Ligand binder design. Structure first.
Ligand SMILES: CO[C@]1(C(=O)O)C[C@H](O)[C@@H](NC(C)=O)[C@H]([C@H](O)[C@H](O)CO)O1
Ligand SMILES: CO[C@]1(C(=O)O)C[C@H](O)[C@@H](NC(C)=O)[C@H]([C@H](O)[C@H](O)CO)O1
Ligand SMILES: CO[C@]1(C(=O)O)C[C@H](O)[C@@H](NC(C)=O)[C@H]([C@H](O)[C@H](O)CO)O1
Ligand SMILES: *[C@@H]1O[C@H](CO)[C@@H](O)[C@H](O)[C@H]1NC(C)=O
Ligand SMILES: *[C@@H]1O[C@H](CO)[C@@H](O)[C@H](O)[C@H]1NC(C)=O
Ligand SMILES: *[C@@H]1O[C@H](CO)[C@@H](O)[C@H](O)[C@H]1NC(C)=O
Ligand SMILES: *[C@@H]1O[C@H](CO)[C@@H](O)[C@H](O)[C@H]1NC(C)=O
Ligand SMILES: *[C@@H]1O[C@H](CO)[C@@H](O)[C@H](O)[C@H]1NC(C)=O
Ligand SMILES: *[C@@H]1O[C@H](CO)[C@@H](O)[C@H](O)[C@H]1NC(C)=O
Ligand SMILES: *[C@@H]1O[C@H](CO)[C@@H](O)[C@H](O)[C@H]1NC(C)=O
Ligand SMILES: *[C@@H]1O[C@H](CO)[C@@H](O)[C@H](O)[C@H]1NC(C)=O
Ligand SMILES: *[C@@H]1O[C@H](CO)[C@@H](O)[C@H](O)[C@H]1NC(C)=O
Lengths: 314, 168, 314, 168, 314, 168
């Protein structure tokens, strides 16, 4: 009588501490390479921003009218998204995006600013809603008539709620100094913003910029988070895009940037721009910037783990 | 392997052994027959399966985006972010490589070990009623039919009952 | 005669590469969970800033009068600490805190600025020392009489010492343009600061801010490090809070933020806000932001290391 | 374990063995007595103690605060800082888990090894004067009193002196 | 007949999981400590900037005239390098250095700005080329005659190439307001810069700064990257140092900072300021900030890996 | 080591063994001679060499500068950068220490294993024609000249040819 062990005709080569390409009876892959080219969103309230840029949901250009108070567990940004209609840009834009991606959505509330002695219906053909309109959550404050002086004014808002208020305002830079005097009256213009933890001043800078959407002017969007029971005060004499509503964060969510369709029939927790990584393997070689609950990215395309004894064929 | 059975004094595996990882190949007077040993096979698979259960687990740490694929973040902070991510990748690629290398060594060595454990168990069952070849086979001097061989495999072999004959 | 091994009636379960919950005769914990709810400071010159904010030690609001030249190996910030008396804020505040936490303390030295033709004793009821006072290390420069013009002036200081000088100055933003003209005379005001490696300009922005300590004005504190043999030059025409003394770093220390008492009877090197981690274990599950010389934070609450053979009871 | 002694052909440990890790249980004519073997016990403890001395060491790297618990630092730099810290935590949690798992496997296997080393040492001392049971016991055919058993334990057993009788 | 193993008279001690200082027959070092005190550059187009600062290659102070369109795989910065001749500084300087270190070099192209009604040959004795000169890639725009008004002007440039254009401009801060009016005419001066992804305004701040190279004035260099088919527009009325040429990145390279000579006879891929690390070992204890393709830095000076059995002498 | 040969029942190594890692030392009637075994030696060196080939490899990840030795970068971003680098250094110093410690344990244990494999191989070649000392030597009762010893070393020893005499 003889003792022995099994073997196979064609084994699988693996690596060990002492040897490369040792044949074992069986092995299994530890590095995931197969991608699902969809955003697997089964079970998750998903918001596909499409042409709405994430920051636009706070200010409300036309393409974001449908997203002014969205609620979501998963937020998808698209390459065609735009935050603006009137050309312009947010200061510290990426910080605000990271805040909104994990917000779970936003809840808007009127801040209660009232005006007298000025026009409040500033509009543009770049923010079209069946004609010239503006950002739905803002008000373009101008003088009552051309070149009239914009009165020095102070507007304050107290966050009476229990979570921080996202406050956004804008600085308008007209294409020329001559244009700035028409809209707000002549001279230097200044807007100061202060809270219990914030202080910053702003002066508009009229001048030519390349034409974007027909305009060589721009609007700068600025923001701060106002703590419960804290107050924000705006002191301005022109060139100020005032906030009409504040935003409040709903809860928790995650945001991704993708170029692929939504699939409510697959479920996943690890996303990248090319789709979803669905895997029980501890490592992946698909995308080093994947986000969610992911296998650890590794540079190797394959790492075979032995699941059987050494293969010794006859 | 470390135990010098598999790929050691046992010259090869049995491609006809389709019913177990380890087994017995006997010849007596009725011919040859081959059967697999369940306990040794199940011990190795249970240990290999335990390794598998460990590595395919959930890491419930969520990581969120810290840069931007559509609108590149500022260069300096972007270079710090890329540098950090590349450093972590360096660490996890090394850990994955080392883990698999180490575990494969241990898996091969553990399978080698289970064979030696089976071999040594049988030799003492047969005690002085046999002397071993040197190739994994036991030269049995008493010689018994298929039910007795069946008794070696399921450990019902009584060395005494055959004691006098085998030494003789 | 029989060979054997020991066993116990009730063993301890551990994990291995191949099996979970294997019983061994003995095991020991590798992850530390027990916290000491005090700042163990035996043997270490400790400064508990209390109501003094760390940045206040450079400018000297009243609550920091006792800390103007502190010396320490361990610095403790408290939640009730304030850097200011007159409302205001430092620019790049966290960078300066990290510098001062490891400074080992500060040594002050007069910078030697002299004035003529202005008042130099600007004071406030917010910085109370038996009445209106100001930051002890600064001087509030104003015009001689109400609305008089503040003369354009230049003040320079050379660091004649062998380590960098911490230079701090302030920009005063009065609550209104009318208030700014009273204190410093009318028109735009500008302060330029330049050294061999620094250049920045500042213009004050008067305006209403919510009332903090009764004031809607604010003071901005700015700072730079002046290298040995280098010179700093201030050019200003008003709204400038001038430095009276420079700060020099004493050596090395560490800073923590805690809400627990000091204990000169326990000794430790790993601190978090809840106390001290005193442990010989290589890992901890107490606070991922602990600082000092610490066990590595891990997410697991327990990792049992076998110290005996497998337990096989009868 | 890899050496198939402990939890292997040795059926159990001795809860009455309170004076060592390994030992001998003999019966002859005077009854039974049990004593522990010092050398094997001390070898295993010395190796386990060495493991302990390695893991409870000082890391004299000081880390300082880079964010703020009372006045939150800027969001973006704070997100980079939280992301980096969470990545390092991921790495150290894995390393701790793997280290303990690996070391526990090796500790169990080393204790198994010390038993086999003790067993094999004794068998050759007794040489041909005995044949082994198969359960960790040596059937001694010559039979000696307690001083002779004492001679097996402290390796003063002379196989020749009893040689003729035992084969007989 | 006896079985045995070899041994040696004097072995090498190593460490294991269970024991420190076990003697083995042979061992080998895993941590590299030997440094080559040269920049091993065999096979690599190397540019040693010497007294040219890396940022100077874009603006062109005299010490960089030889580097205006360099091409390289390896870029070496030296401690004596200077980016400027007229005292001044770049904003976000380190970001631009990291861009240029990996650029593979720069290719300059005229941007095509033409002027009328102003002088364009502003010069200084600080940028000496056989007398007063200026940055070779810039033009100091001034009024035609002393104190004449600098006309509001707009200059635009379209990147017609296929890779981004590095655009650099400057803001001149004269030593006094009186000096600023002579060069550019009186009043506040402003330069606005806008593209499809950029917008920033600048106002000069005249004032005294310590004298560097005889001047208490300074020039601020600013930059942006202009995408293909995008346009940059400069709107200014004085105090503006205009760009004459744009820069384009050649390919890929790496940049180091060293204080040692170049050696075209040794080949390396891991550099630090003290030289080159040439090693097959997986770890190094030489410099934690080494760059290139490097062994991993470790805190240990030595880690001996056993290459032979345990040493048991007789 | 785990296999209790080297530094175990084999008391020492041979400083005169300059031609191999393992070997035979025989005495018969012609005197003593010593020769090395190639196969066992080459197995251990091949395994140790494989370890060496793994650790001296290329990591083709390029890292670029993210701070400045001549003009210090901003303090806060510099503190984040120093903190991250010091954390990675902590990780790689641990990994290097653990890797070498683990590999040295395995190297010593593998060399121990190769000895036991050589020892057990020879014992079964000699089968019942010899009984082992207990120190790594085989008491050969038949006794043969140098060509026969040469036959043990190169595995051309026929136990049967000497079978009757040795038991006798
Ligand atoms: C240039 O045409 C318009 C526009 O549609 O943008 C006409 C708008 O009614 C006008 N709106 C206001 C409130 O002034 C707008 C404006 O003059 C510019 O956008 C200012 O830069 O221009
Ligand atoms: C408003 O009352 C006071 C104050 O106590 O703060 C009176 C101070 O004497 C006065 N000091 C000076 C130097 O002007 C101070 C000041 O008017 C405001 O703080 C300016 O904003 O106000
Ligand atoms: C102060 O002497 C000079 C100089 O050489 O720097 C003379 C230069 O010709 C002059 N150039 C111009 C274009 O004005 C220069 C200038 O006045 C200052 O540098 C302005 O701060 O000064
Ligand atoms: C080989 O291993 C994999 C993973 O353990 C398993 O799914 C597969 O069924 C195995 N194949 C055989 C033939 O055992
Ligand atoms: C805010 O003030 C109200 C009283 O008006 C109080 O009930 C509430 O607790 C306060 N909230 C906070 C966060 O201080
Ligand atoms: C970060 O990494 C990506 C590649 O993964 C690269 O394209 C991007 O430019 C990097 N960020 C910066 C600022 O270079
Ligand atoms: C079990 O192990 C711990 C740590 O090694 C030790 O302190 C304790 O005394 C041990 N207990 C026994 C009964 O050996
Ligand atoms: C500063 O200058 C003095 C001469 O006044 C000199 O002694 C000293 O070494 C200099 N220090 C430095 C840091 O250059
Ligand atoms: C960093 O982490 C803490 C939790 O550990 C969190 O509360 C804080 O918000 C984080 N920082 C930022 C900027 O989110
Ligand atoms: C010892 O090991 C090193 C590295 O493996 C090798 O270069 C050297 O030649 C060895 N020495 C001997 C005597 O084998
Ligand atoms: C730029 O426009 C030209 C047409 O003038 C076109 O050929 C080219 O593809 C465009 N490039 C990009 C990057 O859009
Ligand atoms: C980063 O590290 C170096 C030492 O390696 C130190 O000198 C430098 O100051 C550090 N950076 C900052 C901003 O402290």
């Amino acid at each position: 009588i003889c003792l022995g062990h099994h073997a196979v005709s064609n084994g699988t080569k693996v690596n060990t501490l002492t040897e490369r390409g040792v044949e074992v009876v069986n092995a299994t892959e530890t590095v995931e390479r197969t991608n699902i080219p969809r955003i697997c969103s089964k079970g998750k309230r998903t918001v596909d921003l499409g042409q709405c840029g994430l920051l636009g949901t706070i200010t409300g250009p036309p393409q974001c009218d449908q997203f002014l108070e969205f609620s979501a567990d998963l937020i998808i940004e698209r390459r065609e998204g735009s935050d603006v209609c009137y050309p312009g840009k947010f200061v510290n834009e990426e910080a605000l995006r990271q805040i909104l991606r994990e917000s779970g959505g936003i809840d808007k509330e009127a801040m209660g600013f009232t005006y007298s002695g000025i026009r409040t219906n500033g509009a543009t053909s770049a923010c079209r809603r069946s004609g010239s309109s503006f950002y739905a959550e803002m008000k373009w404050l101008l003088s009552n008539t051309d070149n009239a002086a914009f009165p020095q004014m102070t507007k304050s808002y107290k966050n009476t709620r229990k979570s921080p208020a996202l406050i956004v305002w804008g600085i308008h830079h007209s294409k020329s100094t001559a244009e700035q005097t028409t809209l707000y009256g002549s001279g230097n213009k200044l807007v100061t913003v202060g809270s219990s933890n914030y202080q910053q001043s702003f002066v508009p800078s009229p001048g030519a910029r390349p034409q974007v959407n027909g305009l060589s002017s721009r609007i700068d969007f600025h923001w701060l988070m106002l703590n419960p029971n804290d107050t924000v005060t705006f002191s301005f004499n022109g060139a100020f895009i005032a906030p009409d509503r504040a935003s409040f964060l709903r809860g928790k969510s995650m945001g991704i940037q993708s170029g692929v369709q939504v699939d409510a029939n697959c479920e996943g927790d690890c996303y990248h721009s090319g789709g979803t990584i669905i895997s029980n393997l501890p490592f992946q070689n698909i995308d080093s910037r994947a986000v969610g609950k992911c296998p650890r990215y590794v540079k190797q395309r394959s790492l075979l783990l032995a699941t059987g004894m050494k293969n010794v064929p006859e | 392997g470390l135990f010098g059975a598999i790929a050691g004094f046992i010259e090869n595996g049995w491609e006809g052994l389709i019913d177990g990882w380890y087994g017995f190949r006997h010849q007596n007077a009725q011919g040859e027959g081959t059967a697999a040993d369940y306990k040794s096979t199940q011990s190795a698979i249970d240990q290999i399966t335990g390794k598998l259960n460990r590595l395919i687990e959930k890491t419930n740490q969520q990581f969120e985006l810290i840069d931007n694929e559509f609108n590149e973040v500022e260069k300096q902070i972007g270079n710090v972010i890329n540098w950090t991510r590349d450093s972590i990748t360096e660490v996890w690629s090394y850990n994955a490589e080392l883990l698999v290398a180490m575990e494969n060594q241990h898996t091969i060595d553990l399978a080698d070990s289970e064979m030696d454990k089976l071999y040594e168990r049988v030799k003492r069952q047969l005690r002085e009623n046999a002397e071993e070849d040197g190739t994994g086979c036991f030269e049995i001097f008493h010689k018994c039919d298929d039910d007795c061989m069946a008794s070696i495999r399921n450990n019902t072999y009584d060395h005494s009952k055959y004691r006098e004959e085998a030494m003789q």
